[PDB]
Design a protein around this ligand. Structure first.
Ligand SMILES: C[S@@+](CC[C@H](N)C(=O)[O-])C[C@H]1O[C@@H](n2cnc3c(N)ncnc32)[C@H](O)[C@@H]1O
Ligand SMILES: C[S@@+](CC[C@H](N)C(=O)[O-])C[C@H]1O[C@@H](n2cnc3c(N)ncnc32)[C@H](O)[C@@H]1O
Lengths: 219, 219
């Protein structure tokens, strides 16, 4: 079900303590988020830092974040971007982003975070119909699993060559090994993994962080 | 001791099968190396692939590979570079590179791989004396632990801004937690981790691959 030990593992704690450089506002947002219903679905701190580091590495200016929740990944990305950077973040529930907004403000990153409260598929299609193919530097796919294939295809088209497409929670607690009959979400995660496996448009790494992290680098 | 389950476990095999894209020669090099005593000293295939992927991502042209062994990481890196790319690979033991060379040839990568048969510290000093500071794109530190702090510093100097410095085996089978008395290598690993943790010259991720993998991105 899970490749890594419990969070309380001493070796895991050492990994975190010897690597984490979490912004105070980001840290405050995480601790708040963990008290919320579905707080355990949030992006983990070391995943967010890896993605922010990669965004910084490639000098990203334009990021796309699917599944805002409380805005943890959006804020992590925003902090990796220069002053004129923008994160377009997509969500359907208005409540969770409003929990994170005060922390976006504290981090002086609220102006960098562009919240689009509508289904992600709608925002993706709009961006493309506006002719914004090949303009995004980083895309994070962490919304619903039902539409994740459509999300992957659209994010890939929105990324420039050399862009980074991250898909979160790709092992689905080990259910990808044999998705239960009628488990739409699990079948969807499994189907996308197969597609990405075959995709010659990208080169890829699958990492044992969180519930599995795919990094697909666009050619 | 380990953050990860055994390599042959079901979920790990899934992660590999859904991500791995070794060039046939690179695959053959791995399999051949694994027929040798201590063959599993080679870095795992997904670590080499992550490193090769990040090299490609940043359009690397020059790489440093400390601890050639049979040439697995050297070849992985070479395959991520353009025709005129170069990997300076450093090794003290003449025998293992002889094993890998036929696979370097099979991969059309011999002209890209620059083998320096002598202590890595000597090669690093030579490159710096030659005016190569700030010109390498990727540096992989996978030799002896006794000199790993010296390797880190020299590699950091040799890397350009935006370069990637990878340190392998940073958890040292959990001995970093409390290095046993007289365990000089474990103390060396522990000491470097504290320096990197504090190091303002880089931004960092520590990943639960192999025996721990540190990625330090140069500012
Ligand atoms: C796993 S959470 C995202 C975690 C978040 N990225 C973080 O950093 O903590 C999944 C989010 O996707 C949202 N979501 C579900 N369907 C969506 C859709 N069609 N479009 C956009 N967001 C959606 C959920 O409401 C939820 O907040
Ligand atoms: C863990 S193996 C490297 C594995 C290789 N990176 C791979 O991916 O397959 C460590 C290597 O460092 C070499 N080594 C030991 N001391 C060295 C030194 N002072 N300079 C260069 N290489 C050294 C060893 O002989 C050994 O081949």
């Amino acid at each position: 079900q899970c490749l890594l030990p419990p969070e309380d593992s001493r070796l895991w704690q050492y990994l975190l303590s010897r690597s984490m450089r979490e912004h105070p506002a980001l840290r405050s947002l995480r601790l708040l988020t963990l008290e919320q219903p579905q707080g355990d679905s949030m992006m983990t701190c070391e995943q967010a830092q890896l993605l922010a580091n990669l965004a910084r590495l490639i000098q990203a200016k334009k990021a796309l974040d699917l599944g805002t929740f409380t805005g943890y990944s959006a804020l992590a990305l925003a902090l990796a971007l220069p002053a004129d950077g923008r994160v377009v973040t997509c969500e359907v529930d208005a409540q969770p982003p409003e929990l994170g907004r005060p922390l976006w403000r504290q981090a002086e990153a609220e102006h960098k975070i562009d919240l689009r409260l509508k289904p992600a598929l709608e925002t993706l299609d709009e961006l493309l119909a506006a002719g914004e193919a090949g303009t995004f530097d980083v895309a994070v796919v962490d919304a619903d699993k039902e539409n994740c294939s459509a999300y992957y295809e659209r994010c890939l088209q929105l990324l420039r060559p050399g862009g980074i497409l991250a898909v979160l929670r790709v092992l689905w607690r080990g259910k990808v090994l044999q998705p239960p009959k009628g488990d739409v979400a699990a079948e969807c995660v499994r189907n996308l993994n197969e597609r990405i496996r075959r995709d010659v448009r990208v080169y890829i790494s699958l990492l044992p962080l969180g519930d599995g992290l795919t990094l697909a680098f666009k050619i």
